[PDB]
Amino acid sequence: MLIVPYNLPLPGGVVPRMLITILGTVKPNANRIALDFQRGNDVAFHFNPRFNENNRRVIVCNTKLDNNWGREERQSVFPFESGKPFKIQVLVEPDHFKVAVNDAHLLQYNHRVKKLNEISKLGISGDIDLTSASYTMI
Numbered sequence: 001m002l003i004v005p006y007n008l009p010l011p012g013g014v015v016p017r018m019l020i021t022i023l024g025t026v027k028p029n030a031n032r033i034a035l036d037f038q039r040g041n042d043v044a045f046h047f048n049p050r051f052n053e054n055n056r057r058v059i060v061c062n063t064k065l066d067n068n069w070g071r072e073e074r075q076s077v078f079p080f081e082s083g084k085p086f087k088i089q090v091l092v093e094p095d096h097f098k099v100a101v102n103d104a105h106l107l108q109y110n111h112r113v114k115k116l117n118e119i120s121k122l123g124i125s126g127d128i129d130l131t132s133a134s135y136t137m138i
């Protein structure tokens with residue numbers, strides 16, 4: 001397993017047609033997972049499965065600019081399960097990030113950070129055993 005939290009450099013930032021694939025297994029009794037696509041200290045796209053927010057499972061998505069979180073976008077479809085292997089695929093499209101989990105479309109997140117080629121790192125954190133993290137151009 002890779003060491004979490006894990007930084008995946010994205011050389012030259014992201015660009016449409018770039019596919020990021022994360023393979024891992026959720027720990028037992030998980031509380032949270034996070035993917036943070038970063039532009040220096042800013043978070044262009046925060047993808048945050050929460051296993052217990054007032055006894056509900058929810059994925060929260062947001063952007064952090066100058067240390068300030070913005071308006072959350074929330075998804076009640078929740079494909080993750082404590083103890084089970086998952087695949088997250090993040091495809092950069094021209095107007096949004098498109099996210100699929102276990103080969104099923106989950107959500108899309110409109111680009112708030114516009115300088116895509118400056119989103120140069122992906123942080124992977126939370127209650128997972130991380131198997132692999134990679135990218136390819138499709």
Ligand SMILES: CO[C@@H]1O[C@H](CO)[C@H](O)[C@H](OC(=O)c2ccc(C)cc2)[C@@H]1OC(=O)c1ccc(Cl)cc1[N+](=O)[O-]
Pocket residue numbers: 031032033046048049050052053054060061062069070072
């Ligand atoms: C309002 O709360 C914030 O919302 C943001 C999204 O809008 C982030 O998700 C923040 O989290 C972190 O930036 C962050 C959190 C932990 C670390 C180890 C590093 C960074 C934080 O979320 C929680 O604290 C939170 C609030 C309620 C619940 Cl139930 C779960 C979470 N959470 O997953 O941390």
Ligand SMILES: [Cl-]
Pocket residue numbers: 001002003
């Ligand atoms: Cl590692």
Ligand SMILES: [Cl-]
Pocket residue numbers: 112113114115
């Ligand atoms: Cl920008």
